[PDB]
């Protein structure tokens, strides 16, 4: 139901200002892309395999509070979230799923994999570790299809006993609602880095009827651009100085606000055109943030495995973006390393 | 009408809307970084 599925949302978002506004510490005054969904959603695939301390670590460090959202709600909240966003889209390309590659030698649970397979789109390869180097290939080549070319090399370091790999992939591509006329794209125009600096980038231009605000409690103009099906995007630009002061406010809260103040109207906009790409060791990140047992030689993985013959090692998240004159093109992929317990 | 430059550091977010999901997040500093 839908009550269920707005609350992994509200939650899962607060989540992706946490876990940015952590970036803004790892990396300062440095340009961040992630999928906030590709990481939660890797991460809950996780927790349907473990048990006790582990289990609640993983949920609770994702946001969730299991007295108001208990354990199976997440599961059937995350099962249903995954499966509206694969729901077919007119004209618009959303796909996001996940990938397990499992240790010849592992035995897992029927149970895990049924419940992957069957509810969680996941794929199922039984991979050999023992060629790691063939392995590495075969995960990132498999991501590389699946985000349509587009994230490239996710893993670049796979320890020599890894026995298993999670991976979760998100691809996105759609056009504006109203597209940018090309002829108006200015060549090379100014853009400000700091406050002494310029780089030069393609200012695409339109004049047109766009949801946008001032937040004047935040001090920033908030500018939606319409995909021209069920996505938007939103553009937060901060008056001069105020860049801080707005990532330490952002929450689910925010957006709620934005939702109902935003409203439609003519705008003489200049947005540019531009990729970027980032990447992120997550390990050390999710370790600080309170999973902790995952890792440890007590943990408890014992809906995964029969034998509860692992434990994670290193995590990793990539993502790039495209915006240009025709829409936005993105994508993003989480890595989870297991090695034995 | 009221002009929008975004010619400075800005945040992205691209939502869902059936799902209220933010399905990608950033900050663009300099969009020309390789
Ligand atoms: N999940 S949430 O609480 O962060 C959230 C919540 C809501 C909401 O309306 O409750 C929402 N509405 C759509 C919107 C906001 C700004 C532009 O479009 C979007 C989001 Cl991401
Ligand atoms: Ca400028
Ligand atoms: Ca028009
Ligand atoms: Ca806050
Ligand atoms: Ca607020």
Redesign the interface.
Known sequence: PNAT??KM??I??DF??NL?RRF?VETP?????????SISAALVMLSFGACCSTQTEIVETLGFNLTDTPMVEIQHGFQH?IC??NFPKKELE?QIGNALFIGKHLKPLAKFLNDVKTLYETEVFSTDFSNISAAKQEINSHVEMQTKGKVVGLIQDLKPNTIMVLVNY?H?KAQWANPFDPSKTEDS?????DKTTT???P?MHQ?EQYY?LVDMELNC?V?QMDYSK?????????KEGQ?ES??AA?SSKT?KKWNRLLQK????????K?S?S?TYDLGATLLKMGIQHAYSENADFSGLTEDNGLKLSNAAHK?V?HIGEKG?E?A?AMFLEAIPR | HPIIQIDRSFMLLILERSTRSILFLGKVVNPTEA
């Open positions: 599925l707005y949302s509200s899962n978002a992706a200002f940015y803004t005054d440095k340009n961040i892309f992630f999928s906030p969904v979230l509206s966003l959303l998100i996105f125009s100014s853009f400000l880095i780089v030069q980038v200012m004049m946008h103009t500018l069920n996505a938007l995007a939103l553009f937060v630009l901060p860049m707005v990532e952002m957006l109207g003519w705008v003489d906009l200049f947005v540019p531009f970027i980032a993502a973006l936005t993105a993003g």
